[PDB]
Amino acid sequence: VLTQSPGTLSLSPGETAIISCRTSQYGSLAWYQQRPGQAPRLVIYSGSTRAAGIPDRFSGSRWGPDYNLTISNLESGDFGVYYCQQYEFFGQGTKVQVDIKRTVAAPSVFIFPPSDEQLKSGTASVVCLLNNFYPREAKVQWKVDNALQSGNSQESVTEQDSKDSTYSLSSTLTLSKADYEKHKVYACEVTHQGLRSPVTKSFNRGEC
Amino acid sequence: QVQLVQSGGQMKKPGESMRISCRASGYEFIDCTLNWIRLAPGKRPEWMGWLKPRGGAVNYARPLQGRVTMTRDVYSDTAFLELRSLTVDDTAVYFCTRGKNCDYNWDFEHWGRGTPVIVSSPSTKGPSVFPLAPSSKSTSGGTAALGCLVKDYFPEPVTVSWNSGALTSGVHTFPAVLQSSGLYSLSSVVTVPSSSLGTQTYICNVNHKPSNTKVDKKAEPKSC
Amino acid sequence: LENVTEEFNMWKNNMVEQMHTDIISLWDQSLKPCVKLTPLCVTLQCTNVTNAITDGELKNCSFNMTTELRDKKQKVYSLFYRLDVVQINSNKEYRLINCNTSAITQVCPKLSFEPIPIHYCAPAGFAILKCKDKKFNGTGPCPSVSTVQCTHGIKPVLSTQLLLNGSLAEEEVMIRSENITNNAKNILVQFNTPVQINCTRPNNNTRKSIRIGPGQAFYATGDIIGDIRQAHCNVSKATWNETLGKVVKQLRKHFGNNTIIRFANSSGGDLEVTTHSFNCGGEFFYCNTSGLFNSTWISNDSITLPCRIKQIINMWQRIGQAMYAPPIQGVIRCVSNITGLILTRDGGSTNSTTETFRPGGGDMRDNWRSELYKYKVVKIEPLGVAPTRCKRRV
Amino acid sequence: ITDGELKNCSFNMTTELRDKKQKVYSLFYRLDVVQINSNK
Amino acid sequence: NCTRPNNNTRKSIRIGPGQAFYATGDIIGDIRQAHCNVSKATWNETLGKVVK
Ligand SMILES: *[C@@H]1O[C@H](CO)[C@@H](O[C@@H]2O[C@H](CO)[C@@H](O[C@@H]3O[C@H](CO)[C@@H](O)[C@H](O[C@H]4O[C@H](CO)[C@@H](O)[C@H](O)[C@@H]4O)[C@@H]3O)[C@H](O)[C@H]2NC(C)=O)[C@H](O)[C@H]1NC(C)=O
Ligand SMILES: *[C@@H]1O[C@H](CO)[C@@H](O[C@@H]2O[C@H](CO)[C@@H](O[C@@H]3O[C@H](CO)[C@@H](O)[C@H](O)[C@@H]3O)[C@H](O)[C@H]2NC(C)=O)[C@H](O)[C@H]1NC(C)=O
Ligand SMILES: *[C@@H]1O[C@H](CO)[C@@H](O[C@@H]2O[C@H](CO)[C@@H](O[C@@H]3O[C@H](CO)[C@@H](O)[C@H](O)[C@@H]3O)[C@H](O)[C@H]2NC(C)=O)[C@H](O)[C@H]1NC(C)=O
Ligand SMILES: *[C@@H]1O[C@H](CO)[C@@H](O[C@@H]2O[C@H](CO)[C@@H](O[C@@H]3O[C@H](CO)[C@@H](O)[C@H](O)[C@@H]3O)[C@H](O)[C@H]2NC(C)=O)[C@H](O)[C@H]1NC(C)=O
Ligand SMILES: *[C@@H]1O[C@H](CO)[C@@H](O[C@@H]2O[C@H](CO)[C@@H](O[C@@H]3O[C@H](CO)[C@@H](O)[C@H](O)[C@@H]3O)[C@H](O)[C@H]2NC(C)=O)[C@H](O)[C@H]1NC(C)=O
Ligand SMILES: *[C@@H]1O[C@H](CO)[C@@H](O[C@@H]2O[C@H](CO)[C@@H](O[C@@H]3O[C@H](CO)[C@@H](O)[C@H](O)[C@@H]3O)[C@H](O)[C@H]2NC(C)=O)[C@H](O)[C@H]1NC(C)=O
Ligand SMILES: *[C@@H]1O[C@H](CO)[C@@H](O[C@@H]2O[C@H](CO)[C@@H](O)[C@H](O)[C@H]2NC(C)=O)[C@H](O)[C@H]1NC(C)=O
Ligand SMILES: *[C@@H]1O[C@H](CO)[C@@H](O[C@@H]2O[C@H](CO)[C@@H](O)[C@H](O)[C@H]2NC(C)=O)[C@H](O)[C@H]1NC(C)=O
Ligand SMILES: *[C@@H]1O[C@H](CO)[C@@H](O[C@@H]2O[C@H](CO)[C@@H](O)[C@H](O)[C@H]2NC(C)=O)[C@H](O)[C@H]1NC(C)=O
Ligand SMILES: *[C@@H]1O[C@H](CO)[C@@H](O[C@@H]2O[C@H](CO)[C@@H](O)[C@H](O)[C@H]2NC(C)=O)[C@H](O)[C@H]1NC(C)=O
Ligand SMILES: *[C@@H]1O[C@H](CO)[C@@H](O[C@@H]2O[C@H](CO)[C@@H](O)[C@H](O)[C@H]2NC(C)=O)[C@H](O)[C@H]1NC(C)=O
Ligand SMILES: *[C@@H]1O[C@H](CO)[C@@H](O[C@@H]2O[C@H](CO)[C@@H](O)[C@H](O)[C@H]2NC(C)=O)[C@H](O)[C@H]1NC(C)=O
Ligand SMILES: *[C@@H]1O[C@H](CO)[C@@H](O[C@@H]2O[C@H](CO)[C@@H](O)[C@H](O)[C@H]2NC(C)=O)[C@H](O)[C@H]1NC(C)=O
Ligand SMILES: *[C@@H]1O[C@H](CO)[C@@H](O[C@@H]2O[C@H](CO)[C@@H](O)[C@H](O)[C@H]2NC(C)=O)[C@H](O)[C@H]1NC(C)=O
Ligand SMILES: *[C@@H]1O[C@H](CO)[C@@H](O[C@@H]2O[C@H](CO)[C@@H](O)[C@H](O)[C@H]2NC(C)=O)[C@H](O)[C@H]1NC(C)=O
Ligand SMILES: *[C@@H]1O[C@H](CO)[C@@H](O)[C@H](O)[C@H]1NC(C)=O
Ligand SMILES: *[C@@H]1O[C@H](CO)[C@@H](O)[C@H](O)[C@H]1NC(C)=O
Ligand SMILES: *[C@@H]1O[C@H](CO)[C@@H](O)[C@H](O)[C@H]1NC(C)=O
Ligand SMILES: *[C@@H]1O[C@H](CO)[C@@H](O)[C@H](O)[C@H]1NC(C)=O
Ligand SMILES: *[C@@H]1O[C@H](CO)[C@@H](O)[C@H](O)[C@H]1NC(C)=O
Ligand SMILES: *[C@@H]1O[C@H](CO)[C@@H](O)[C@H](O)[C@H]1NC(C)=O
């Protein structure tokens, strides 16, 4: 009914930010600003009409079901969460995340098994450390036997860790021990701007 | 001046009534429609219902009927909202807004400060600490994920350290993955260099202070 | 007017709102000379009526009032409905309702209230248009326009949730709303056939009076000559059950197909908006209609609607105003027919399997917008130029 | 008070019921208060 | 410039059905008199113009 994308807007200040809805049914649209931890305020209304006290760097478009929000010259008071309402139904919220400019990064796929403390209990947990990433905008591909078998996991990232100004991505598994023998082949393939191909590195579990 | 002054905190426990209120000011109370929004964190916001003054005529959403109830006191300009049978998933902030003019409903010009109601349940969900072992004994130039996963802990928070704060830098504390059971599981990895793996038995020190316990386990390299 | 095509809009018409202004002015400028009841408030000890009663919804109170001399107490009594009596905290000490907020005025018991039809007429230099054609969802063009001096018969009848004594539709049930996807709006249905309703009450009450100051009189209820039974209101289950079929058929057309349509009663509010309120003969009823609307629709028997009666009312949902309705002698038997419904839709979850409609209310400006959707007031402009082949010779 | 130009009075008034006394009080300026002729 | 350090309160008393009398409540602070200030230079060289 209301679908917002992309969920993360990793942008630098001084830039332009684009956020887009796409509705189905006929009716007015508005955008609100969840300025983080305050009462939100109405940025655009009636589709493309600014509200009072809202600067001129904000406008809407376009034809048919499609809508945009433009944020020209992104400043500090604009990093927040952005909502899109149609009469009563909202959207899930997009996050405009701050990013400082860095040279492109060098990848590394580091996959390590769980310990013998609580592996034997009947559970399992395998991670994929993905150090030295830039940019934030990237896709994780936890490949098991050359097939995506992630399931209930989550691409849970940390911030741009300002000791190195880099990100660190991950992908996990929530499998039990009873069928853990199906997943002995592990691979992570992650691409970036400084990569012609997704990074990969085969690590056998017969070497401990 | 159109200012909607809310009232309260608060914390509750499950299965109890709750009652909040909006003292409206700056406009004719008896003439404009009010509204109610449930900004829960990390999720899609949700409108709950109206309340027309002058008649008291109400409308509610459909996933709330039999629990939500709205009413007003026209002599004190104070709307009220109640909700029976609160579950722990009813933690949010409850906002109480008003449109810009009094012709179109959904144009949320005015907002109120927020009334964050938080329901807490007695639930142990104690320590389940899964440290992550470096299989590399000492791989020169390699870096391991000397980390530690927590399985199905509740309630918030949960932390992790290593051998009484020996490993402080490189601790990429990943966010907690909310599993399908309604129980979150923390993941946390640490970049540790090659020779430092077998130098000391770095103990995964996960504090489980909401259950008043803690479990400390090591992540030594395996044998397979 | 052949070839004339105008465009109307029944929701931006201002004939409805200025009539609403002039209706509520008449009820206020008439009651200036109608006594009052400032001395009516008293501790008023009260018991239960002990008659042959099929049912504590009628009480036997007692109180002190001032006699002709303004120095001698006079202990009197009368009957009061359950809704007029409030407990404060042996035996029970009650307070009159709406003493702490407003001031109570007795409507003079010589003034008729009967809705006599109204004809609105335009003055000079104006004109009234009229859209005679059908299949008019209040907006858009109109191929059949005429010109009239006066609007047709309008009868100011202040009902809620169901339109009584209205004007029937032409061929089908006409459903009109500002926007159907907008939940904060009412839906007006209009019947092409009436459904008849009969409200009675076996009252057979009495009238007493108490002099309250020199030249003032308060009319109270005397005693009960007969038995006590509740009021009711009957509707037939065949003309009613095959009327909602017609309303479902036009509702199904907007929302689509394979839409389960549910009807359900009012979800909360003041007594004024969760009940139906009549005025038969000079009495004000409050009948429970949650049996007309309890139904689901896929793909000599009647219904008794119970009713409650109140004497201190507030017709216009205002602040600080009340009026006391005087009693009438005899049993009331009033026949009316229903021509329309005011509906409202519940918002909420996105399931295109079921929609649920409840009776709407809360506004008197919908009884009239159903009748003034035919007219539009224009303004005449007599001057005009055009070129010709004609020259003034000097 | 850096200054008897403001007084603390007390009086009987009628409550919601018009048969029960209600002893209330309020402040009055010196100019609103007149002496007629123990206490005053 | 006229001021007053009043900081008074407002009470009310219902006086009959539907009537209200607004009275003064209590004093939240101290009591000082009112006053009104004018400058002795713009004033003393204004009456010179009127005298003229
Ligand atoms: C619309 O219809 C619904 C039904 O679909 C209706 O909801 C019902 O309302 C009635 C009251 O109108 C509720 O009935 C109460 O039920 C409780 C049980 O939980 C009883 O204990 C209550 O008893 C009261 O009255 C007694 C005297 O009769 C007292 O002695 C006693 O102390 C209580 O005060 C009362 O009967 C009922 O819970 C709901 N719900 C259902 C599912 O029945 C709704 O009211 C209708 N809407 C309108 C505007 O009427
Ligand atoms: C209820 O109110 C809304 C608000 O105006 C009405 O929405 C408007 O509906 C019209 C007709 O569908 C839309 O116009 C059309 O838009 C499409 C876009 O592709 C275009 O192709 C057409 O040429 C025409 O422009 C209009 O966009 C729309 N307004 C908004 C803000 O979306 C709605 O129709 C009303 N409902 C009813 C039942 O009257
Ligand atoms: C409600 O209660 C009041 C008072 O409790 C009733 O009024 C009283 O009714 C009784 C009937 O037993 C009267 O008593 C008889 O009255 C006649 C004439 O007054 C007298 O000749 C008899 O000897 C006997 O006393 C009584 O007078 C009357 N009034 C008072 C002030 O007590 C009233 O009837 C009750 N309501 C109903 C509907 O009955
Ligand atoms: C809807 O319209 C009908 C038609 O006018 C109304 O019915 C009429 O209601 C009045 C109410 O006072 C009836 O008047 C009474 O008549 C009896 C016997 O005729 C008499 O004893 C009374 O003194 C009083 O005059 C009238 O008979 C009745 N029927 C007609 C005129 O045919 C009905 O009331 C309207 N509905 C509403 C809610 O107003
Ligand atoms: C308007 O009419 C509706 C429809 O009848 C009323 O709802 C009904 O009210 C009665 C009494 O309040 C309920 O009866 C009770 O039901 C329980 C069920 O276990 C039973 O144990 C009791 O002995 C008693 O019979 C009835 O259930 C209820 N609902 C229906 C029929 O669906 C409603 O109360 C009326 N509204 C007003 C404001 O008067
Ligand atoms: C002017 O005088 C009146 C009456 O002499 C003062 O009103 C009274 O103020 C006293 C303060 O000592 C109140 O006493 C205390 O009141 C509280 C709550 O009522 C109670 O919990 C204490 O135990 C104690 O009794 C007293 O209630 C209050 N009212 C009356 C009717 O006596 C008034 O304060 C004086 N004016 C100013 C500006 O203070
Ligand atoms: C009606 O008026 C009579 C007469 O004033 C009231 O009777 C008094 O009631 C009080 C209540 O405690 C007694 O203290 C007095 O002694 C009574 N006086 C007499 C002369 O009987 C009576 O209370 C008033 N109200 C009602 C409801 O009867
Ligand atoms: C006028 O008096 C009525 C007496 O019932 C008041 O109604 C009650 O007021 C209390 C106090 O706010 C509430 O807790 C109750 O729920 C009310 N209803 C009942 C049935 O007791 C009413 O509030 C008074 N008016 C004003 C303006 O205070
Ligand atoms: C309502 O009550 C009155 C009494 O107040 C009834 O009036 C009586 O009417 C009959 C004829 O029907 C006469 O014979 C009696 O003499 C009348 N009594 C009085 C005291 O005048 C009236 O009939 C009742 N109406 C009904 C039963 O509906
Ligand atoms: C209203 O409808 C009811 C529903 O049947 C009718 O019901 C019964 O009618 C007989 C015949 O007089 C009486 O003996 C019963 O007491 C009635 N029962 C009830 C619940 O009313 C009734 O006659 C109808 N009345 C009117 C005036 O329409
Ligand atoms: C509503 O009232 C009308 C008028 O009395 C009733 O219609 C009459 O009902 C009787 C049944 O006893 C028939 O004999 C008559 O032929 C009907 N028509 C007329 C013109 O009198 C109607 O039945 C009532 N509706 C109910 C009770 O639901
Ligand atoms: C409203 O709808 C409900 C649901 O069907 C009705 O409840 C049933 O009514 C029948 C007869 O009235 C009873 O035999 C059943 O026992 C009721 N259901 C239950 C679970 O008890 C209700 O009667 C309807 N009310 C009206 C006025 O139409
Ligand atoms: C006048 O008195 C009122 C109290 O009636 C003062 O109101 C307080 O204002 C402060 C902020 O300045 C708040 O923190 C307090 O909570 C208020 N008290 C109440 C009871 O609301 C007001 O500030 C005073 N104005 C002055 C000092 O000029
Ligand atoms: C009004 O004029 C007087 C005259 O000087 C000003 O006087 C003093 O100002 C100081 C500073 O606040 C205070 O400590 C004294 O108490 C004041 N004395 C008097 C007699 O007021 C005063 O500030 C002026 N105030 C205004 C508001 O104009
Ligand atoms: C009357 O009030 C005005 C406005 O406050 C005073 O003018 C200011 O006085 C202060 C002295 O504290 C200066 O700092 C400001 O520059 C003045 N001007 C403005 C625009 O604020 C004026 O002094 C007062 N007159 C008196 C006290 O006699
Ligand atoms: C009188 O009525 C009250 C409430 O209407 C009720 O509580 C009481 O039981 C009744 N008493 C008798 C004797 O009818
Ligand atoms: C009401 O209407 C439906 C559809 O016409 C029918 O199936 C049902 O039996 C009717 N009920 C009564 C009581 O007439
Ligand atoms: C809806 O159902 C009616 C049944 O008469 C049919 O004529 C109509 O074409 C249907 N519309 C759609 C969109 O299926
Ligand atoms: C509607 O009611 C009126 C008055 O009760 C009656 O005269 C009329 O015949 C009824 N039916 C109609 C207009 O179809
Ligand atoms: C109270 O005020 C009066 C006049 O204002 C004065 O005569 C009297 O002395 C005062 N008493 C006290 C105790 O302040
Ligand atoms: C007032 O005015 C006169 C004339 O200008 C001057 O002599 C005198 O000193 C002034 N006084 C003050 C207080 O300024």
Author numbering:
A (entry chain D): 3 to 27, 30 to 91, 96 to 216
B (entry chain C): 1 to 52, 52A, 53 to 82, 82A, 82B, 82C, 83 to 100, 100A, ...
C (entry chain A): 86 to 136, 148 to 184, 186 to 309, 312 to 323, 323a, 324 to 396, 405 to 406, 412 to 505
D (entry chain I): 149 to 184, 186 to 189
E (entry chain I): 295 to 309, 312 to 323, 323a, 324 to 347
Which text from the study accompanies this structure?
Host cell entry of HIV-1 is accomplished by the envelope glycoprotein (Env) spike. The gp120 segment binds the primary receptor CD4, triggering conformational changes leading to the binding of co-receptor CCR5/CXCR4 that causes global rearrangements in the trimer structure leading to viral and cell membrane fusion and gp120 shedding. In the pre-fusion, closed state, typical of SOSIP trimers, the gp120 domains surround a bundle of three gp41 helices, protecting conserved fusion elements of the trimer. In this study we combined structural and mechanistic information to construct a mutant Env that is no longer responsive to triggering by the CD4 receptor.
The F14 mutations consisted of the layer-1 mutation V68I, layer-2 mutations A204V and V208L, and the outer-domain mutation V255L. The F14 mutations predominantly reside in V1/V2 near the apical region of layer-2 and in layer-1 near the gp120 contact with gp41 HR1. The results for the F14 construct indicated that sCD4 triggering of the open state is nearly eliminated based upon the lack of 17B response together with a ~11-fold reduction in 19B response. To understand the structural basis for the observed lack of CD4-induced conformational rearrangements, we determined structures of the F14 SOSIP trimer in complex with VRC01 and the F14/Vt8 SOSIP trimer in complex with VRC03 and 10-1074 via single particle cryo-electron microscopy (cryo-EM). A total of 77,632 and 84,378 particles yielded final map resolutions of 3.0 Å and 2.9 Å, respectively. As a result of this gp41 restructuring, residue K567 displaced W571 from the layer-1/layer-2 pocket that was formed by residues F43, C54, W69, T71, A73, C74, D107, L111, and T217. Interestingly, the F14 map displayed layer-1 loop densities suggestive of multistate behavior. Specifically, density corresponding to H66 and H72 in a configuration similar to that of the F14/Vt8 structure appeared alongside additional distinct densities, which may correspond to differing H72 sidechain configurations.
